[PDB]
Design an enzyme around this catalytic site. Structure first.
Site: not given
Ligand SMILES: [Zn+2]
Ligand SMILES: [Zn+2]
Lengths: 350, 350
Positions: A78-81, A124, A171, A198, A286, A288, A291
């Site tokens: 939302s950008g508010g946090y 919020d 909340q 929260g 992993c 990846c 990796c």
């Molecule tokens: Zn990896």
């Protein structure tokens, strides 16, 4: 595909696995949404983007998807946090060039619309931890009023209402009566998804899990549950055990830039001298790309040499570890063996 | 393949194109050798590696190729250019942990052997610019003595002599008689390749090209000519015009980390506000991966956001630009149109 369709394919205890279908793609759940920078959906930081380059500018440049070259779903906060306060909203001046900014349920919605998000978060009011019951209740009640304004603003923009989705945010701090109140307001307004807000505020895993044990069953069971700001691998496994379907956390990227790697044997600090001669890959299971090709010893070296490539391999590794974790969680629930996986996960991770 | 075979396939004016065959692969020439971190060969920094993690350690870990996962040829420098002085060599203490270090033609060779380099550089004495003729001659004469010691040390290590190659380095500052002296000593000792040393020292392109016009024809024509430390795209095109076959320069990587991108229309500073809304790729003819997917505007943003991914895309772009440039130079010489390319290159670059 539909605008939004959540389907639960399998269950074990409170944990669920299934999919979210949207026009730009399918999201397998439980899901980890990495920051914009195997994932089915990513996160856009609204506050950051609003400050640079600006929402108007991003819209001018074709929207967030074309701007970052990502054509799959995107969730914006939302950008508010990340953010002059009142019931109307909040105004702030930019640190980059002192420009004046206003955020509200209506303006937040408009900005996420300009960004072109597929999943929009209601605006919020953050609730500090710890909070008195009084303060928690006051903040929660304003958040539910802002949740209704967000819904209306969302619904009054035809293109958003028809192609995007809105999540409401629960909340109430750590008090059960407030959470229940919040859950009931949210369901009475009605959203496509329900986030648990929260809980990413330094409370400690124990208390987080305690509050999730009574909070998640209050939310509608047939909609996705999103745990914002969480978290470490062991927080995710425990929150999935308690019914959450969606997650986001800066952990992988930051850890990635500060020399820390996630592995099935726990996080490792790769800059430590004990890795200088370690020929094993970042993690042995992993799959990846890092990796595949490189050793702990060479990445240690990269990072120690201040080379940029090192932080890059580390972040890539961490991002991939998180998706493999979610994949292991999806498969285990789908197979009726998530309870086992979780226990085996902990034994080795810790 | 042979230990080392240099073959010239085509010529235009003084420029040449062809190949170097070695056991670990073929090197197409004129060649750009990027730093370790389309290339046929990369560079290892001997001085850096000797300080961390150490040559013994790298040998223990299997050699440089296995350590960085690169199984193609590698050229290492002698380590002295980056560096208690005498005719025997030089001793220095490490800044990382005060350990004491010695470099000499013999020790340099031994270290590049431990690193497992495919192309070894003789150890010589840097010549500051500007230098008096007296100082240039004294430094050059010591370098030629060190060139003979390097040859002998190289030849006394069976595994190196049989699988690696040695380049000698021409010195003499900007004086033609010294260069000629240097060239004759080097050829009398005999090497696999001849580098032109001492020209990456702030002299300005004009003087560099002047000294290359008489220096390169002194070297044996049937061996590769390596111009160390050079350089910018326009220096490479002009040095290829003057007979050089090999190049190395930190330009792409550093430029890559300090917001600067090479393009056929000149280098650009991507952090500049004029790129904030530019949807064109880094370079329009670049076939590079970055260039495929992302716009100047998003990379501008990345970098401006301090995101690491940005510097990474920039470096990747720059590395690829340099290989495409060498590819354009090889093809143009092979086609008898290098003279044209060079002129067209300049018109657009400048
Ligand atoms: Zn990896
Ligand atoms: Zn490119």
């Amino acid at each position: 595909r539909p605008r939004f369709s959540f389907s639960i394919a399998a269950r074990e205890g409170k944990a669920r696995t299934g999919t979210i279908e949207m026009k730009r793609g399918v999201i397998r759940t439980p899901a980890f949404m990495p920051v914009g920078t195997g994932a089915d959906i990513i996160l856009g930081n609204t506050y950051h983007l609003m400050l640079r380059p600006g929402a108007e500018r991003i819209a001018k440049l074709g929207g967030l998807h074309s701007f970052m070259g990502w054509d799959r779903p995107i969730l914006t906060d939302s950008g508010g946090y990340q953010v002059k306060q009142s019931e109307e909203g909040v105004t702030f001046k930019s640190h980059l060039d002192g420009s004046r900014h206003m955020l509200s349920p209506e303006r937040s919605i408009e900005i996420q619309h300009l960004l072109g998000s597929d999943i929009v978060m209601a605006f919020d009011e953050c609730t500090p931890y710890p909070a008195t019951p009084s303060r928690a209740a006051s903040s929660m009640e304003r958040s539910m009023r802002w949740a209704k304004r967000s819904r209306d603003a969302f619904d009054s923009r035809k293109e958003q209402a028809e192609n995007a989705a809105l999540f409401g945010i629960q909340q109430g701090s750590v008090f059960e009566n407030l959470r229940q109140q919040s859950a009931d307001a949210l369901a009475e307004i009605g959203f496509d998804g329900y986030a648990v807000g929260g809980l990413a505020v330094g409370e400690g895993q124990d208390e987080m899990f305690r509050v999730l044990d009574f909070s998640v069953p209050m939310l509608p069971d047939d909609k996705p549950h999103y745990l914002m700001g969480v978290g470490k691998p062991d927080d995710i496994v425990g929150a999935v055990e308690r019914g959450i379907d969606m997650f986001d956390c800066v952990l992988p990227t930051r850890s990635g830039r500060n020399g820390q790697a996630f592995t099935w044997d726990g996080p490792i600090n790769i800059r430590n001298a004990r890795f200088s001669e370690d020929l094993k890959p970042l993690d042995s299971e992993c799959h990846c790309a890092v990796c595949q090709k490189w050793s702990r010893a060479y990445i240690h070296h990269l990072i120690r040499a201040g080379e940029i490539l090192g932080a890059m391999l580390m972040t890539e590794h961490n991002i991939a570890f998180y998706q493999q974790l979610m994949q292991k969680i999806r498969d285990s629930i789908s197979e009726g063996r998530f309870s086992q996986f979780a226990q085996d996960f902990r034994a080795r991770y810790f």
